[PDB]
């Protein structure tokens with residue numbers, strides 16, 4: 254189990270660590286989070302008390318370095334930092350643990366929620382979506398735009414999700430206009446899976462990451478990306494059986510985890526009704542359809 | 554975007570544009586089977602593609618063979634339309650290709666947009682006008698060429714005959730739609746109006762009689778009365 258220590262907490266802030274979250278009061282004696290499960294990526298996130306504008310945060314993997322959080326009063330945010338001095342980092346952290354100034358990552362032993370939400374997400378791939386190569390962790394916030402949004406403005410601060418457009422020359426074979434538009438299998442399997450993602454684990458990783466950024470940062474472009482990636486599978490008549498089974502589980506846990514009160518904005522009614530009730534895969538998402546109907550029947 | 558009564562004069566500016574109407578692409582008769590079930594029998598059809606400024610009609614004839622062994626024909630028909638339209642654009646020299654294609658039904662938007670992804674500069678738009686182009690098969694010469702086709706075929710017409718020599722395209726188009734609207738509301742009466750007189754003939758190379766300006770006024774008035782009449786007979790007014 255690893256630690257993300259904090260220099261101090263000089264402004265009042267709601268802190269998130271994966272699906273959990275707690276309030277720190279201005280200048281409270283908080284020195285960070287302990288007992289973080291090794292083996293998964295993680296995200297540590299921020300919403301200032303005084304300005305709920307800009308949720309922001311950092312994706313990281315404790316295997317990839319020693320990371321701490323330091324408030325920057327010039328730029329006005331809690332910044333993630335790496336300490337290359339391993340020994341010095343251990344000496345400081347051990348002082349904090351002996352003074353119990355850390356919140357414990359509160360994992361329940363029955364609970365696989367974080368694992369199920371991040372099964373296919375890997376730091377190396379996050380870092381290609383979020384281009385900032387000098388750091389081993391990735392900053393995201395609510396306002397960041399995606400490459401596709403930048404085509405419909407700063408390239409350095411963008412989310413480079415894979416571009417998906419059903420009315421594009423990539424998606425439609427010359428001479429198969431009707432077939433390719435009404436059945437997206439060509440686009441799903443040959444263009445995206447075989448050609449771009451290489452395998453369904455990379456496709457599912459981007460999908461899961463898109464979803465987590467939509468949920469934690471209210472990042473609109475990520476929400477668009479999550480839904481597009483779902484719609485491309487559900488609108489393909491030919492999907493490997495194992496992909497649909499895994500997708501049903503992915504979505505199930507993502508619907509389970511969504512805050513009930515953010516449903517109206519994070520869930521596209523058209524895409525979900527189409528996917529669950531009209532599409533080629535309408536009968537293939539038994540777990541997802543069952544939770545959607547019992548938890549958000551208004552949307553349908 | 555869409556096309557309504559605010560930007561009506563845009564039809565007659567000098568940006569090439571075409572209407573596309575697909576309401577006669579797939580035509581059937583419905584009949585009883587020996588077993589007392591119901592079945593369809595398709596008949597020839599056509600795509601109505603029309604430059605409103607010049608009157609050039611590009612009449613693509615849809616021979617029933619094109620449906621043999623196919624399923625979901627109402628849906629295939631929109632895609633076949635879009636494909637024939639794209640094929641047409643690709644056959645015109647660049648300076649003849651449209652800047653805009655306006656479809657009369659919004660269900661054609663996606664099929665045509667997908668087929669024209671190669672032509673990103675051609676705008677595909679809907680319209681809020683209820684245009685009566687379905688009545689195109691009430692023009693005898695166009696009906697005749699469609700029903701006699703034994704194979705796919707494109708026949709070119711000028712739907713305004715020689716009118717543009719005497720009137721503006723704005724006025725020719727408005728005559729055309731009055732004519733079509735009437736033919737669509739009561740084909741018999743409308744056809745009675747156009748052709749009971751011998752003195753007035755349809756030239757071999759035209760679709761409509763050779764009316765003088767004064768006789769067109771009389772015709773136009775009679776068609777307005779027809780439309781108003783049927784509107785009463787319909788709504789009991």
Ligand SMILES: COC(=O)c1[nH]nc2c1CCCC2
Pocket residue numbers: 258259260321336341342345346
């Ligand atoms: C200025 O602080 C550092 O460079 C540093 N290195 N490791 C830690 C810190 C801050 C205190 C938490 C852990």
